[PDB]
Symmetry: C2
Subunit: 245 residues, 2 copies
């Protein structure tokens, strides 16, 4: 095969992208290559053997909060793949974790496989489709070298967790809970692009703090840990082919 | 210079829901992959009188062949169709559950006034309203006057069933209709500034006495014919009119 030459990061919140942007000296795109009048942000750069791009769903028109959730993440994954034809996608972001599954605040996890906990369609065939079980691209050398934790990720468009959500998340044996991962994998699967995840724990879903409060409290520090890992991930990938990880 | 509507996109989640409409207007399946290669998405195009008509579906899933329902695939095809096909107006036609307390009956084909999500709960200020994603459908007063369709709020979520948490939000948002793509089509259409209108045909009563999946499957064929019937009259009404006339 050929060495990986192009990597796209899909990152939901702009402050989580920014340190990575600055670290690799990436520039904000000016020519709206993913479509006109869109709030989306793309940062581009060439670093050693890798073209590097980072896409975010951008600041919402009303208030400028990050356009989080499965739909915007799915849109930018699709558009950036079609526009750039990367070798690999990395969906980097924050997530909730389970203490009983070994998750701690500030851990940056790799993901083995990914599901939805909030697409409940109680009809055969549709049920499995809804769950949308998908495997992350195998990166055994990356995991070993960086000494990263790993677990199943469960995706849904809510930050909190209803009773029904929790039953499905426990049943699927997830270590991690986010708001976009499985939608990224659906699009990547559709377009035959390998996908890796980097999910950084801001809050303990089985813990003694409310989710929204804990997430907001740890966001700044955990973002920094996520940048430290994503940086190492980029350097590791440089000059390797997909077989090497 | 402004002009009468020349191009319409239909976004339809299930192929069987799209076919009656395809047959009615003699549309043919595109072979040129206008939205991108290697995808399961299906596009039908044709010309009826003064209007070019595109019907797009998220396609049958690779595993078992079932319709790729839900907000993500709908929002992708909306996005790709807008960019490639450059429509004047989008119509999101599909089936939905209805609340009989809100005046909905099985076989009713509604015109949506506005749209929300009931399954994006982000209990943080600013994020909360964003998650709900309240959006107004394009104003079509004359169409409503002509066609006499019931109207009401649509509430969107990626589940066919309704958890207790979903219900609380659906009740408080005073929706008449419940579906699986609507608010996401609206989101995408807003982003790209395309007028969107919704035709939602009631297959099951969320506050009735029949299990949802069961009632939906039972009524799907007859309600799909009803939906074709309304969409046909919508297409014929739009013909020759500008946006501001509906
Ligand atoms: N408990 C939790 N559930 C879902 N997403 C979470 C989370 N904690 C952090 N996040 C992530 O950070 C923010 C969202 O984009 C989401 O993906
Ligand atoms: N009770 C219900 N809840 C949600 N969606 C429904 C529904 N009944 C029919 N539908 C729609 O029909 C099909 C799904 O894609 C969904 O959009």
């Amino acid at each position: 095969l050929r060495p990986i030459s192009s990597v796209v990061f899909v990152i939901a919140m702009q402050a989580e992208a920014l340190p990575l942007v600055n670290k690799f000296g990436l520039s904000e795109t000016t020519d709206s290559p993913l479509g006109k009048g869109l709030p989306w942000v793309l940062y581009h750069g060439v670093h050693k053997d890798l073209r590097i791009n980072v896409v975010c769903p951008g600041r919402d028109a009303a208030l400028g909060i990050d356009s989080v959730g499965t739909v915007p993440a799915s849109l930018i994954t699709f558009a950036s793949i079609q526009a750039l034809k990367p070798d690999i996608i990395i969906n980097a972001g924050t997530c909730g974790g389970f203490k009983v599954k070994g998750a701690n605040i500030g851990d940056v996890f790799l993901v083995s496989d990914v599901v939805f906990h909030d697409r409940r369609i109680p009809i055969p065939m549709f049920d499995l489709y809804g769950v949308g079980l998908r495997q992350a691209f195998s990166t055994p050398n990356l995991l070993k070298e960086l000494n990263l934790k790993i677990g199943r990720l469960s995706t849904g468009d809510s930050l909190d967790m209803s009773t029904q959500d929790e039953t499905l998340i426990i049943a699927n044996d997830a270590t991690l809970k986010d708001m976009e991962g499985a939608a990224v994998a659906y699009v990547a699967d559709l377009l035959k692009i390998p996908v890796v995840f980097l999910k950084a724990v801001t809050d303990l879903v089985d813990g003694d703090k409310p989710t929204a409060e804990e997430f907001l409290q740890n966001l700044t520090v955990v973002t920094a840990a996520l940048e430290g890992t994503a940086t190492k991930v980029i350097n590791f990938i440089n000059g390797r082919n997909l077989s090497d990880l």
